[PDB]
Amino acid sequence: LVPVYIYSPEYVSMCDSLAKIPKRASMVHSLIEAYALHKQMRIVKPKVASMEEMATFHTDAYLQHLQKVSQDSIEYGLGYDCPATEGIFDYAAAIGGATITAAQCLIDGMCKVAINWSGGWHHAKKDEASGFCYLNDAVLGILRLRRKFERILYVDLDLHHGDGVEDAFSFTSKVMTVSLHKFSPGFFPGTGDVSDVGLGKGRYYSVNVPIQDGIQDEKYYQICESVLKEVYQAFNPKAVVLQLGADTIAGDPMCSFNMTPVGIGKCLKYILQWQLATLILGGGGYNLANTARCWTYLTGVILGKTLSSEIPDHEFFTAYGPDYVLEITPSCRPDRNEPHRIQQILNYIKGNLKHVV
Template sequence: MDVFDLSSQEEFSPMKPLTKRPRKCFNQASDTLNQSSDKQSSGTLTVETSSSCDVKSDKPEVNLTERVDDIKRTSVSTEDANFVTDKTNIQGTNGAEVNSGDNCDRDCRKPVYIYDQELVRRCDAMPKIINRASMVHSLIEAYGLISLMQVVPPRRASDEEMMGFHAKDYIDFLALLSRQTDEEKFDEESDQYGLTYDCPINHHVYAYAALTSGASLRAAECLLEGRSIVAINWCGGWHHAKRDTASGFCYVNDIVLSILKLREKYDRVLYVDLDVHHGDGVEDAFCASSKVMTVSVHKHSPGFFPGSGGLNDGGVGKGRGHTVNIPLQDGMRDKEFVPLVCRVLRKVQEVFRPQAVVCQCGADGLSGDPMDSFNLTHTAYSCCVQFILQWTLPTLILGGGGYHSANTARCWTYLTAVICGRKPPTDIPDHKFFMAYGPDYELPISPGNRRNTNSRENLQRIYNSIIESLNKLTVS
């Protein structure tokens, strides 16, 4: 089939509805994204440049009265900023747990949001993303979304926790730097550990790495504890860091650490990477594992960092077939990105049957980003995230790249609203960073006009190759 034929009614389409019941997208407080009882699905994946994306799952009707591992949710009706909450019970399609039983606290229906002032202050100080964390949190706060989430403070990861993946000598060196004032004294050792141009050294880097990785670990712990089915850490998502080296602005790989934490309970964990750069650090960590599947959709072009993530990179040993790469070229647009990614994810979910998901939402594929690669808008990210969330699996949402701070804040605020079941107003509310959103002062991100060098024939070839590989996969 033509993966980009959005009017297709073939059975393969993950958007083909099997029931007439209105679609329920996660939030334990959500039923808001352009649903109405009299609207029937057309069996298509709708890609809009406005504020909605109607993504549907190819799953049979679930008997709500017979399943005991149900998830309690709250349905919210939204009129811009006004909310009315009405309780209802909806079955999780994969039996994911959220404080099950009648004693479930009301707050357990809300997404977890990792935040405190020190975390934002540490992230704001990093050279490549100055003040980005403050802009993201301030916009989320300005839209009134904080009250719809459980705000959980991060903690610092211990050396032992970071050494669950990273080499002891590397973590020891980061700690050593924190006790020094003469950074040039360690130039030679810094080069050895990748602490150069992309990852400049400073005596704050150890505290930053410990806190950001601890924040993602705390988010994963909230999922393990059943505090919610979704946890958000926009200060995480640093996917390039290797076992013994920093790389690509990433000092400690909080993603690998959080996946290892989720593996303490969940046998199979799916990692989805939406960053414009290949998630090489995470892929390298799990390429030989059959228990973690990595899916990275990224730009793959000569000279573009990190240069890995080709179509034929499919894992090694027991992990063969558990690494999926979707390599793209400049100019990718929403209308090709969404159906390609969602249909690959649909097949991944079918064959791998994940029990938990980690999704990195690096925003450097947005139009206007200094990476100057894709033409994506917030809608592309929203559609992919909604598609994942409707599986009702424990899901960890992380940040990552995104070097146009205002657009990154726009995108992640919109995703936060989607997770909370809210359709945010178009106009940016007045707040500390209001002037950064000029000249239009609106939340939606317009698509870019970079020439699209992704031919449909090549994208279809990529899709066919991935599906052929996944069809051969046997999950233990």
């Protein structure tokens, strides 16, 4: 009944090759390994996603294109955010396979929790790489979980709107998506206002919480709990997919939100308490050490352990300087979230939730 840890050196190596975030998978894994948390989980080597498996969501023209490029590209969303570099198809196939493997562990009852810290690439569209995402692994995970579990809840706590996942499932009532994100014109991807609720038979089954710069642990949790509690009771999910992108975290060069891993960990504890099949994904996170600190810490809460404050010696110890501690401060900058507007967001959501289900 011990949590599944998707991990292999091939896999971490493949994920270290993402141009946007070099060496990040290693640092995350290395910190986890340094805390010996992998000794407390069941290490599962990820499958490589076969063509037909990624075909469950991505159109075949796209998939076949990635393959050749890996060996009109502006049409398939490739370019600046998504380079056509030697091996990107193997990259996508590894990330997608990893999330699929996590979900497959879940549906097989191998574990209550399965973790793929290298996943969470929530922007990719069916025929279109986007926002560093070549392949929407969260979508393929949800789709795999759907083979056994009737209703899936996707909760996305990344800084950016989980548009690709929302889009994938916006028409159905069987998957509800809940996104907490910066919403400010010009800030990627620009979608996901509170009024975005899903479409057709999927109407009211998309939830969006547009937040502004400076949010801290206390208030983010207040909001997240308020939305989740109402979501749980109305939707009654059978399994949960949870994206925990660390770009919300104090010290991220995106410098938008002002979270510490402790406040995100509260939200996680709240989801874990539902005691449901839960697929844990990573995502954004551009301060590499802090991201490692964050997910290592969340791995701690999954296991129900509290970790030493001192960063253990390991491959990447020097990146943790000068303090070499697990915890995060809080930059001192204003909380641009007027509590009036948060209450209008919260009400509007609760109103939408009364139509579920």
